[PDB]
């Protein structure tokens, strides 16, 4: 007689597989399990989901399938089909889609009774991501794994191994994606929504942080010349003209900017991601210096105004040395037609005078505004990095 | 003998699992539920379709099912594959796609024939979300349980619990994600779409709310600058004539944020969300702020012009007060060529001062008259909240 | 003995489900249905496809499964699993997807052999929509129910009740959404492709309207005001120039809106949808109003031109008549430099009197093309409405 | 007895399934198929994939399923459930996805062993598809139908029907969408990728072609207009300075639509579909629009230049004949402001002469070029049509 | 009697299918496999994932399904249901979603026990691709089969054929696609993630290359016309002021431009895709560009300024020779009123000499400038080709 199958027909004979087997009902079977994670798929912030392939191990002590490694020639290890035998009805509580797992066919089972199940597993899973320091992230996400069924009396969750040996596993793993975790967390939980009901549920805290590396070069590198080109704006002489309209291109092109990081950034109702703030100061930074850009051409323009009154004109002084025959009737015609003609040409000279005295200082304390404002930031860079 | 799986071939021996299981068949079997609220995973609104993952209770007394714990060594409860028995029809009338939900293959049983079930289930549902106050609304969504199939006669259903303990009930939810719910309303209702026929159906009005604190700093944000680039706006001189492309820039700028919140809006023909008329009169407000921008602009301009009539320059010095040798004939063809040159500059230099008055002057009225709108929504804002 | 389950083991115990099930094989057992339509959930029109809940039922007379209400204690309806009984093999012909609706587990018989069932369904279906008349269309889609396999031998379909009572059937609907239907028009069909088979058809000429309350506060009033812009822009005087880059920003502006209507709008091959020529109508109205502005700026600008020719000139002032010592030659020399420059000043003068007055009627025939074309439109809406 | 099912009984007996069913095992088991196309769901280029609904048949001589129609009451055509008998391993070597079509559970069977089965099957199918003449395109997709498994040995495939009647089968087909077939071709293949086997195939040379209907005043209506924006360009004056910027804003216009076209024509690397080219033109047409916008803006501006020489003057003249007491020294000072001052603008009267009739002869040129190369794509209209 | 399903009958009596099939169970009963790559269909790079359609072949020795060719007419191969048999548990470790293939339901037997296995799979799978040197990349993507469950006690892996065939093997493959395979690399490798523990697989080191032959004309063709517009920009004079608002507008040209490519380019965080920087070094030859252009008119306008000073003048003329009765108070009023101010005008005229043979050398230097670094980029060509 072949001996492989001659086990297989003395074992499943009457194993009646729908039962939770056990010799005395009082017993809870512990299941004992792990994770091992792969990789991290996708993180759609705006979904609020997250896709993670993991590989997983179960075994837990079946009463019913001992057999003696005598009679059946030394064996202790043997294949089972999964559909043939018990299970527990684990699942995670955070799914949004379990159909994405082929189902393995095939178990191990040992002689004493240690049913071995291994099994990948791939779950859009939602947990609450953390979007506040956007590129510098941790996002401390959870899998809880559950009996969905099954109290305490009938069956125990604990782990396979040492728990400081699920913390820093990264024997197999996918990095250069856009993830990369630091530890998992695994913690035990005695659940019990209500009274006279108790579960199982042993958590996992897993963290994750993103590269920033990309980001900084698609995100921060577009913010930053945005400054120099407003900056380089200021270089432009306030009677133009266009300087106004060269601003206003800009603003609207920073307006063009923002909506493209509306949608990046998710509908998380924690409030606005940090960087966001950081982000929009930029363009009230841009009114301010658009607010100085029509400040000086509504001074400066020729508009048959008023004189400058000489104590801002001596305090334009001070910026300045803070910053650095009857026919003569007919002849009197002419002059009288010139003498305002040329003079009012000079009181627009006059104004003229203010507007490259504020032209220089409004410069630096623009520059410097922005210049220690910057410095701020890349000290919060040493901070977040 | 092992005495646990003795009960499971003395109890499904003969259960014939295509039978509604009752002693007499006058009798309805009544099942009996409950929902718990677990999260609100998205609302598309655009699609008038909304996702939510409900656990789920149920249990029905069943007549076949019943042992003493005599005999069994005192055992009350014991878990059953669900496809070795019968299950109830029920079905929520308003899914879009049930296929992520898994298969709890387990159930328990009571010695009474009390058969318990748990199940998770996730739906796409359909329900008349309303749109009219946008970033202040309650959703009163509507999950219709019912037995797809079975009649009165057959099975009534019912709640597990006291509505009450329903309808407070947060005792696990995923809050900080968009959505909160205040509370799930359940309700009997008894139905029949014709004669002779009558179903079971018991509702759960679930209203939820939006936090709006994202979406404020996402929509009205940029609602409020865009107002104060043109009161900017009208500091520009009048005689530049970028002031016109100024405003036409920004035209052209909110008629593009327009078409943003176009799609980000449904398509919901109970009419307009409600902001968006408040947003639809900021055009408006634009056009009659271009329509100002046009008037003094046609009013100023070097067009070589007839006088200004005292009656209006009265009222322009009114508003000014309520806003605050036959060489001869050589020569005289030289003052002939000036006297009139000179002359209709000034002539242009009349027209300008009406420019200036009119220019102070509409600046506040439209400075109180947007001002004035302002004060209208947050009071509207403390109604909302 | 319990008696419920001892007539399904007395119906059950012979009836094999292979069978079409009839005492003569001549017979044809014939099937008879209706619709209940539920909702209506979407129409993406590009994708040539229909999305439809429909509630749905079916009996047939089913020789084998007669009992008497005698010796079974006056039972005349009873619960069957489907998967345990034959069933015939309807389906649609117009679907694209049956994935999406659950499994009815359970079935009516009764004591004469009428199996009832009900189920629900929902088929993502291609039918050929109809987008000419855009916001005001009718959509006459059909449902072909279809037996797949049989013919008119072994089956024939019928209706459930009166076509007139599936006529004006809205009993249950969601309305409020999108969509709204007047009526269900049924008709049977008999089916031959070819010769020697004949299958059993049943249409469903579903006809559906439009709420065009939500499309034409979404694309008519973009519409309206991209017309006062460009009236107010004749407002501007000529001569500033950026009164032609005005109009062009208007022709980017609306460069831009009609791409947004492109993709918006499917891609049917029976031509332009109607409203798009009434669309596209409006940049053409740009255009020449544009080409008016590089008209009147051709005429007029200081380029040293030559006199305005007497007859235009009266028919300029008809047309304003219907719009409404050797000391001299040191000194012959001063005015021989201004008797042509003052001149040449009037020359440009004199045709700037030529750009006013076709300001004035070039406005009015430009308005009155539009108001006129305006009525055009609004007696198409009485007409569509 | 009722005699319908004594038949079922009396054939499904010892029917094992589980064999490919002949009475000698060299005979191959021929099947016999044809397509009856129905509709082109959805061409998406840029995925290379091609989604199409088929109505299927089939039959193949069963050795196992004979009969005789005495002793079964003359009985020759009979219901079958699928799963219950053999079926052979076909399916199409293109797919994508098949899970959209149901599974009919019912086939026929005659006395003499033809047993038929009927199916409507999609599939999402990848056949290479060419791009090059995009609006009037034919699409040689081929549906290469094979048994995955058996060889010559096993099964041959062959038509059911004359093939001519496959060629210009039109029977049914929903047309009016975008697509349109001119014939469908079938042919049959002996397949070997190597030696010891063997496979049947038999292709079907799918032909469409596109209705361009749609696209026309889709995409070639923007083509059109476009030019004339920029022929209407010329006819502003050249000293106003916003020409330039009037170009400019349509090369950023024309920017915009460039990128419009680029998502909606696929990634195909057999080269630029063809209309691209012509579309491609159009820039370079007006970047030269534009190089002559410039050069004469350098030619001609007030900038204090050198005199016109005589040689090109004559050549500006044959090209207008090709297109058409001491008180003196004061008064001495007088006429030296102005000998040169009114000399410098009749300087630059000079250039300005220049400016138009380049401004003449260059428009025709640029019109003449553009209008001949108007007159080649029509021709190519005739061939394409 | 028929023999075919005799030998079925005589086979599959006893093939206990729960049994990894074996004599002896020291034996690893080896599987034997190979690929035969059918088309790349999609590489989508942001979403870090890869669909491929593959032909696929196993053998095994199965012990137990062996016969003779007597007894039952000559007969070596013989079609079985899967599901009647065994079958490994092998599948991929790389995948995203296993739903797409259909199950072959057939495979072959010979009378050694040689079961064959051939079916179709594609998978969406993930593995780490580069993205660096973007439009000539090879990726290095890997497949590597593996048993889920069995150890190598259990079964072992190998090739069917040698791995040269399986290396230049192009005997069917869909190109003409976006990609090409230049190869496809086996090789054994023994995995253990652990102690006690030891796993077969086998990777596929398969690699494929991108034809850029679409991407050149998509990609660096917008690229190349922007430099010349800018290159054309100079030629426009520089008191105009719009040649300020040109580049700008080309700035905001540009700034359009560089969002269209980012979302091309997937998150990867190995870095900056390679010719990304060669793109953004645009930006900032068009910034110095811009520099350029802000420099001459902060340089040259009319703004009354001071004299140049002849050392910069000399080297301006350098730069050229490398580039190339008390009535007479009354009249000295009229020339005082014009000494200065025809002097003012030249003292501008003098400045204005200084944009001029800037606006000569710079346009080399900047020519010169991109000129020499077009041509490093063609080298890079040859390179990559
Ligand atoms: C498989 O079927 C094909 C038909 O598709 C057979 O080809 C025909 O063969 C006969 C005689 O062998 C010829 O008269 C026909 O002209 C052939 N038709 C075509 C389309 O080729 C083929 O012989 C069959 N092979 C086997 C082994 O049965
Ligand atoms: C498992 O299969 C591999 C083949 O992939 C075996 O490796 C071969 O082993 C033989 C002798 O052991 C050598 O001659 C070959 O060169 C090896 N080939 C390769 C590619 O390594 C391996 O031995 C097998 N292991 C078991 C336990 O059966
Ligand atoms: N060769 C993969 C088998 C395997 C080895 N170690 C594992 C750990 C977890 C798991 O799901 C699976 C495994
Ligand atoms: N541990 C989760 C079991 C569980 C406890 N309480 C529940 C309430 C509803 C439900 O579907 C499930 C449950
Ligand atoms: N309670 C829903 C049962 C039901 C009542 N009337 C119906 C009509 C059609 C249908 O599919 C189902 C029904
Ligand atoms: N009434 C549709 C049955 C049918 C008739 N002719 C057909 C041809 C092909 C097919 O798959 C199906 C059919
Ligand atoms: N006619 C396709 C059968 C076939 C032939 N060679 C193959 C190789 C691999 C495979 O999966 C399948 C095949």
Redesign the interface.
Known sequence: Q????RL??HL?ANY????????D?RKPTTVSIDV?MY?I??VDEK???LTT?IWYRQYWTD??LQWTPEDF?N?T?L???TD?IW?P?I?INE??????S?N?????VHHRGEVQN???L?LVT?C?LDIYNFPFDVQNCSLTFTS???TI??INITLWRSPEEVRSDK??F?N???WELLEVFPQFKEFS?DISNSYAEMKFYVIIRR?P???A??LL??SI?LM??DI?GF???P????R???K??????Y??????V?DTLP??????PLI?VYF?VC??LL?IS??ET??I??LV?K??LQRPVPDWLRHLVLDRIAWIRG??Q??????H??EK??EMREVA?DW?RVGYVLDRLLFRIYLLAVLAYSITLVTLWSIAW
């Open positions: 072949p001996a492989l199958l297989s027909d499943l009646k597989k729908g039962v939770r087997p056990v010799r009902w091992i990789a798929l996708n979904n609020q989901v392939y009463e019913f020639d064996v290890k294949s089972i089909p043939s299970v009805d699942l799914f949004v889609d379990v159909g994405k082929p393995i066919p095939y178990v191990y291994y099994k990948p791939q939602a609450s969905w069924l099954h009396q009938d024997s197999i996918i250069q994606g856009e929504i590269r590396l990309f980001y070069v698609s590198l577009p010349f120099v080109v380089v270089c432009l002489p009677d133009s003209g266009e106004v309209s060269f206003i291109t800009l603003l609207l092109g307006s063009v900017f923002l909506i493209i509306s509908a998380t109702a924690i409030g606005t966001g929009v363009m009230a009114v658009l607010a029509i400040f051409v509504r323009h508009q048959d026919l003569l007919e002849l009197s015609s002419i002059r037609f010139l003609r040329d000279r003229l």
